[PDB]
Amino acid sequence: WGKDHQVLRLSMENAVGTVCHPSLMNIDAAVGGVNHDPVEAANPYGAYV
Amino acid sequence: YLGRGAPPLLDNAAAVYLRNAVVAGNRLGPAQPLPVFGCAQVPRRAGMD
Amino acid sequence: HGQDAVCEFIATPVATDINYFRRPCNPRGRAAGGVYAGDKEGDVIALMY
């Protein structure tokens, strides 16, 4: 109920401004920011072609 | 799409296709493009309750 | 019983939810008031149509 006791609704077509913007595909800050302090061998089985 | 902090989609058709699919009628949606220097200019509506 | 009142019918989509109707709302479908106008000149008559 919004202000005024009006019963309201959101749903998920409502998230199109957030997740349908090309911020979803931008991770370069993440992949570089987790890169530092290198990590051990990961048993590159499913990790290697 | 009211700000710019996002490197866009690399297909320029994809970018403009999705921008104005989202931005089409949004209550926040930019009135005129996001000026390079300027305010994002949320449209003002004839009335509010 | 008293002065006969007069009912009037505005054809509406059957698929208009009952919730816009479980409230004081406007019979036409949209707020027409000049109470809501922003006094930005043409607000009322934009506020409406």
Distances (CA, A) of C14 to A9, A29, A47, B35, B36: 20, 51, 56, 43, 46
C32 to chain B: nearest residue by CA? B47
A11, A17 contact by CB (below 8 A) = no
As beta bridge partners, residue C39 has: none
Dihedral (CA of A42, A30, B30, C29) sign: positive
Q: Residue C32's CB: how many other CB atoms inside 10 A? A: 16
Pairwise CA distance, residues B26 & B23, whole Å: 5
Beta-carbon contacts of residue B32 (< 8 Å; ≥ 6 apart): B41
Segments of C1-49 assigned E as strands = none
CA atoms within 13 A of residue B18's CA, in its CB half-sphere: 16
Q: Which residues, other chains included, contact B18 with Cβ-Cβ below 8 Å and sequence gap of 6+?
A: A20, A21, A22, B9
Instruction: Give the integer Cα–Cα distance in Å for A18 and A8.
Output: 20
Contact partners, residue C2, CB within 8 Å, separation at least 6: none
Give the residues across from C37 on adjacent strands: B47
> How big is the A-B interface in CB pairs under 8 Å?
23
Q: How far apart are alpha carbons A47 and C23 in whole angstroms?
A: 59
Report the C-alpha gap between A23 and C48 in whole angstroms.
37
Q: Give the N- to C-terminal CA distance of chain B in Å, as an integer.
A: 26
Breaks (C-N over 2.5 A) in chain B follow: none
Q: What are the backbone dihedrals phi and psi of residue B47, each rounded to the nearest 5 degrees, phi first?
A: -160, 165
Residues of chain B found within 8 Å of residue A21, distances taken between Cβ atoms: 1, 6, 18, 22
List the 1-49 stretch of B: residues with Cβ below 8 A of A.
Answer: 1, 5-9, 15, 18, 21-22, 26, 28
Q: Which residues, at least 6 apart from C38, have a Cβ–Cβ distance to it below 8 Å?
A: B44, B45, B46, B47, B48, C47
Contacts of A1 (CB under 8 A, 6+ apart): A7, A8
